[PDB]
Amino acid sequence: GPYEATWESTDKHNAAPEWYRDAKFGVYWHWGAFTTAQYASEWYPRNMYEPDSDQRKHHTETYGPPEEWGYENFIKGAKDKKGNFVQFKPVLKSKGGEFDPEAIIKIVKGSGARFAGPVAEHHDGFSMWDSKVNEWNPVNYGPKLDLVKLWADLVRENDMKLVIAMHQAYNYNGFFQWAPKTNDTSLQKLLGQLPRDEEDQLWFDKHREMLDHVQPDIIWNDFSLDSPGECGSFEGPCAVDEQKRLEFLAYYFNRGEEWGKEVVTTYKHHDHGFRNTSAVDDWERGGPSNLVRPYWQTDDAISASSWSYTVGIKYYSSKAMVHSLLDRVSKNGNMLLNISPMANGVLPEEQIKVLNDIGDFLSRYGEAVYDTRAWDIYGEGPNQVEGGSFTAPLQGNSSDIRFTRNKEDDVLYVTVLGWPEDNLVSVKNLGSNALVDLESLKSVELLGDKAGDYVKVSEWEQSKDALDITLPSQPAESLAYVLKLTFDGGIPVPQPERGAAVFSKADATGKGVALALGTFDTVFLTEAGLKPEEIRSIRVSDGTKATLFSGFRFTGESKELSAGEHEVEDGSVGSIVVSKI
Ligand SMILES: *[C@@H]1O[C@H](CO)[C@@H](O[C@@H]2O[C@H](CO)[C@@H](O[C@@H]3O[C@H](CO[C@H]4O[C@H](CO)[C@@H](O)[C@H](O)[C@@H]4O)[C@@H](O)[C@H](O[C@H]4O[C@H](CO)[C@@H](O)[C@H](O)[C@@H]4O[C@H]4O[C@H](CO)[C@@H](O)[C@H](O)[C@@H]4O[C@H]4O[C@H](CO)[C@@H](O)[C@H](O)[C@@H]4O)[C@@H]3O)[C@H](O)[C@H]2NC(C)=O)[C@H](O)[C@H]1NC(C)=O
Ligand SMILES: *[C@@H]1O[C@H](CO)[C@@H](O[C@@H]2O[C@H](CO)[C@@H](O[C@@H]3O[C@H](CO)[C@@H](O)[C@H](O[C@H]4O[C@H](CO)[C@@H](O)[C@H](O)[C@@H]4O[C@H]4O[C@H](CO)[C@@H](O)[C@H](O)[C@@H]4O[C@H]4O[C@H](CO)[C@@H](O)[C@H](O)[C@@H]4O)[C@@H]3O)[C@H](O)[C@H]2NC(C)=O)[C@H](O)[C@H]1NC(C)=O
Ligand SMILES: *[C@@H]1O[C@H](CO)[C@@H](O)[C@H](O)[C@H]1NC(C)=O
Ligand SMILES: *[C@@H]1O[C@H](CO)[C@@H](O)[C@H](O)[C@H]1NC(C)=O
Ligand code: NA
């Protein structure tokens, strides 16, 4: 194929194709031999060995000292301290068991997911397809099933794109640091104890074999691709050999071409292992606090605990999952939601309810979500994501709105995260302070009880503070409500309270992009719809300054502009920093 194992060659791959930007919502599942103990988290295989840990205590009391009853026993099977046989060994419903993958995929489809799939290999060294390069797999041991193939075939049968999650870098970069050393070369492969060159080759060989086996539309990667300092006390680079990363990218992108498919690979945002030229950044739980470009995604989980099922696990609400999805989508990302089947393969009813409720929202209000794109301002209101460390998912109310818009850029969806008791929705960024002319606002409609229903909104006034919209009779109850605002000739460009707006014509008219406080490089401005060479004017808000750079990313000649309107020379700007005075 055309791709070579170099950064320059693989940079040319289109990171986020249109189908992926259209998709918005997907589902995957942390289910595997790491679930067998149903204790603590999916990191149980690592922590069962940790000195003085609660997981080691539990393991020692339940199974045996981890030096005698090692993690491999969950895969190969062994009796616990009370004499019960323990093994990851799901039994198909068609064979009289409880594992019903077909039912689970129907539930996932019903949730409105447009991409779905398994964790194919976590950190624990267990490849869940029929693997020749890794004997530690569920065809050789346990259920005698190619779980990844089973899932993939069902995902395709149900008209969803296939995502496969792979976490096999941390396996040999410290996950198993507390496991006993072994001279058994098979056990070394499970526990990441092979020579590092062999481990680096195996990282690639696992990817290669898996992706040829099931032809994934998305390959999702966890950390330790190149994330120095992130592997705790283990002495090592917290990384995969650079050559092997490049060989993976070229191999996958070449197979995509061969298959006639636009494929995607993701990596953790903070990780340096891939580049945002050809791979999609995957943000930490909660996502970014702001609207980020280029297109990105984030993972989340129903569980209020672990990513893998544990006894006593608690869950978040349907409302929080839906409001979180809206928030991510408004900020120019997708949300990949993790679910957590029990070790026997059963999906708990609380999780099914959440998925049903998300699907009930998306089947009704999908117009405001699927196939849309971010506006230049993601939303308004008091309830926000802080970013950084996660605590609990976003839950908004009638005070909060999130924006999305259509591809034609003449329809703005205003989604309010609760029913206003005062029957009023006030959109600040469409008020007069926002310097917005509403002459072109042709209609305002409330989306109704079923998709394709619209209830006309008759009364609205534009104040200084906001477009003040009076709502009609409340439709059937839902977790959020959607207003559809149709303009002729395009949505107006708002002036942020503190911020700026750039324009393609010299007098603050034409195509434009609103900017918050922050840093906006050539990629940002281009994706937002105005290549910076085409900027010919800028309006800087009161209390704000803008610094223009000739360079792509805040280098080169610079110029500072205070509050007001300014003309810009064609081709003079590459990037912009917008700051509070
Ligand atoms: C996708 O991946 C790519 C590749 O990894 C990512 O690209 C990286 O992006 C980084 C963030 O933009 C960028 O880093 C910036 O580089 C600037 C240029 O650096 C080079 O030139 C300077 C000058 O010769 C050298 O000193 C420097 O060593 C480099 O060689 C730096 O100037 C940037 O530093 C400033 O910003 C950071 C915040 O990011 C601050 O911590 C830092 O203190 C600097 O602060 C000033 O400028 C910023 C404007 O960015 C202001 O916000 C801030 O208030 C500071 O203001 C003072 O100075 C400015 C003049 O600079 C002045 O006008 C102002 O009034 C203040 O006095 C920063 O380090 C990487 O270079 C870039 N890497 C590559 C390979 O391209 C990309 O982000 C990824 N995309 C996404 C979406 O994640
Ligand atoms: C005090 O403050 C100062 C100033 O802030 C600190 O200095 C900074 O220190 C950084 C860390 O050393 C330094 O970054 C390094 O810069 C070099 C030169 O550009 C760069 O090569 C380094 O990148 C490698 O190493 C990091 C791990 O730190 C990896 O994440 C990265 O992938 C690179 O790994 C490659 O090189 C390694 C050898 O260095 C190999 O071991 C590794 O396998 C890998 O090799 C492959 O890739 C190569 C291409 O990347 C390829 O050629 C090769 O063949 C292989 O394929 C790292 O970024 C900053 O430059 C430095 N800043 C300044 C201004 O000096 C200092 O740390 C502070 N002190 C303390 C105590 O904190
Ligand atoms: C593993 O092999 C090495 C190399 O021969 C040897 O030094 C070590 O003692 C062996 N481990 C055990 C537990 O015997
Ligand atoms: C919505 O949330 C905000 C922020 O917590 C709060 O100020 C407001 O009173 C809430 N509205 C209702 C109706 O509870
Ligand atoms: Na690209």
226 lines ligand 2 (CB under 6 A): yes
Cβ-proximal residues to 68 (8 Å cutoff; 6+ apart), any chain: none
> Are the C-beta atoms of 58 and 145 separated by less than 8 Å?
no
Write out the residue range of the structural domain in which residue 8 sits.
Answer: 1-370
SS (H, E, C) 482-536: EEEEEECCCCCCCCCCCCEEEECCCCCCCCEEEECCEEECHHHHHHCCCCHHHCC
Identify the experimental approach.
X-ray
| Apex 391 CA angle, 386 and 392, nearest 5 | 95
Sheet holding 467-470, edge to edge: 424-427, 467-470, 460-462
What counts of helices (H) and strands (E) characterise the chain? Answer: 13, 27
Q: Within its chain, how far is the Cα of 190 from the centroid?
A: 28
Q: Whose CA is nearest to atom 12 of ligand 1?
A: 553
Same domain, yes or no: 116 and 189: yes
Instruction: List, in sequence order, every beta strand (DSSP E) within 293-438.
Output: 296-301, 333-339, 379-380, 401-405, 411-416, 424-427
Q: Whose CA is nearest to atom 80 of ligand 1?
A: 276
The half-sphere exposure of 24 on its side-chain side, counting CA atoms within 13 A, is 25
Place of tokens 């950084």: 388
Last residue of a domain, one of 445, 470, 492: 492
Residue 331: closest CA among 497, 527, 553, 503: 527
Residue 404: closest CA among 376, 380, 375: 375
Calculate how far, in angstroms, residue 149's C-alpha sits from the geometric centre of ligand 2.
40
CATH of the domain at 574: 2.60.20.10
- Decide: helix, strand or coil at residue 390: coil
| Other Cβ atoms closer than 10 A to 8 | 8
Q: Whose CA is nearest to atom 47 of ligand 1?
A: 554
Same domain, yes or no: 343 and 476: no
> Are the C-beta atoms of 239 and 225 separated by less than 8 Å?
yes
Give the DSSP H or E segment for 537: strand 537-540
Instruction: List, in sequence order, every beta strand (DSSP E) within 59-212.
Output: 78-79, 85-86, 115-121, 161-166
Q: What distance in Å separates the CA atoms of residue 379 and residue 275, rounded to the nearest whole number?
A: 29
Instruction: Give exposure, 69-98, as e/b (b: 16+ Cβ within 10 Å).
Output: bbbbbbbeebeeeeeeebbbbbebeeeeee
Same domain, yes or no: 30 and 172: yes
Same domain, yes or no: 550 and 434: no
Helix-strand-coil split of the chain, %, nearest 5? 25, 25, 50
> Total structural domains in the chain?
3
Same domain, yes or no: 473 and 360: no
Residue 257 φ/ψ, nearest 5 degrees: -55, -45
Instruction: Give exposure, 421-437, as e/b (b: 16+ Cβ within 10 Å).
Output: eeeebbbbbbbebbebe
397 lines ligand 4 (CB under 6 A): yes
Same domain, yes or no: 498 and 408: no
Same domain, yes or no: 19 and 109: yes
Q: Resolution of this PDB entry, in A?
A: 1.6
Same domain, yes or no: 267 and 415: no
Residue 170: closest CA among 231, 126, 119: 231
> Are the C-beta atoms of 170 and 151 separated by less than 8 Å?
no
Q: Which ligand is nearest to the CA of 8?
A: 5
Residues linked to residue 461 through DSSP beta bridges, in sequence order: 468
Calculate how far, in angstroms, residue 382's C-alpha sits from the geometric centre of ligand 4.
8
> Are the C-beta atoms of 142 and 131 separated by less than 8 Å?
no
Token duo for residue 347: 């999906």
Q: What distance in Å separates the CA atoms of residue 342 and residue 344, rounded to the nearest whole number?
A: 5
Same domain, yes or no: 357 and 258: yes
> Are the C-beta atoms of 514 and 471 separated by less than 8 Å?
no
Residue 10: closest CA among 272, 205, 245, 293: 245
Probe ligand 2: pick from 227, 242, 249, max atoms within 8 Å of CB? 242
The half-sphere exposure of 78 on its side-chain side, counting CA atoms within 13 A, is 17
| Apex 446 CA angle, 420 and 402, nearest 5 | 65
Q: Report in angstroms the alpha-carbon separations of 228 from 187, 234, 277.
A: 26, 11, 21
Token duo for residue 320: 């929080």
Probe ligand 4: pick from 323, 383, 397, max atoms within 8 Å of CB? 397
DSSP state of 181: P
Calculate how far, in angstroms, residue 190's C-alpha sits from the geometric centre of ligand 3.
18
Same domain, yes or no: 481 and 499: no
Residue 282 φ/ψ, nearest 5 degrees: -115, 105
- Decide: helix, strand or coil at residue 13: coil
Residue 151: closest CA among 160, 195, 50: 160
> Are the C-beta atoms of 166 and 221 separated by less than 8 Å?
yes
Token duo for residue 192: 């990441």
CATH of the domain at 407: 2.60.40.1180
> Are the C-beta atoms of 413 and 403 separated by less than 8 Å?
yes
Last residue of a domain, one of 319, 344, 370: 370
Last residue of a domain, one of 465, 492, 519: 492
Give the DSSP H or E segment for 351: helix 349-365
Residue 117: closest CA among 154, 170, 168: 154
CATH of the domain at 191: 3.20.20.80
Ligand 1 pocket, CB under 6 A = 276, 292, 519, 547, 553-555, 558, 577
Sheet holding 558-561, edge to edge: 518-520, 575-580, 544-549, 558-561
> Are the C-beta atoms of 535 and 504 separated by less than 8 Å?
yes
Token duo for residue 211: 């992706």
Q: Whose CA is nearest to atom 53 of ligand 1?
A: 577
> Are the C-beta atoms of 205 and 121 separated by less than 8 Å?
no
Residue 438: closest CA among 486, 394, 395, 404: 486
| Apex 136 CA angle, 133 and 138, nearest 5 | 110
Cβ-proximal residues to 363 (8 Å cutoff; 6+ apart), any chain: 112, 451
Query: ω into residue 294 within 30 of 0, thus cis?
Result: yes
Calculate how far, in angstroms, residue 496's C-alpha sits from the geometric centre of ligand 4.
23
Q: What distance in Å separates the CA atoms of residue 459 and residue 547, rounded to the nearest whole number?
A: 41
Same domain, yes or no: 554 and 529: yes
Residue 521: closest CA among 294, 282, 289: 294
- CA-275 nearest atom, ligand 1: 2
Q: Whose CA is nearest to atom 7 of ligand 4?
A: 382
Residue 82 one-letter amino acid: K
Instruction: List, in sequence order, every beta strand (DSSP E) within 317-451.
Output: 333-339, 379-380, 401-405, 411-416, 424-427, 441-447
Same domain, yes or no: 376 and 308: no
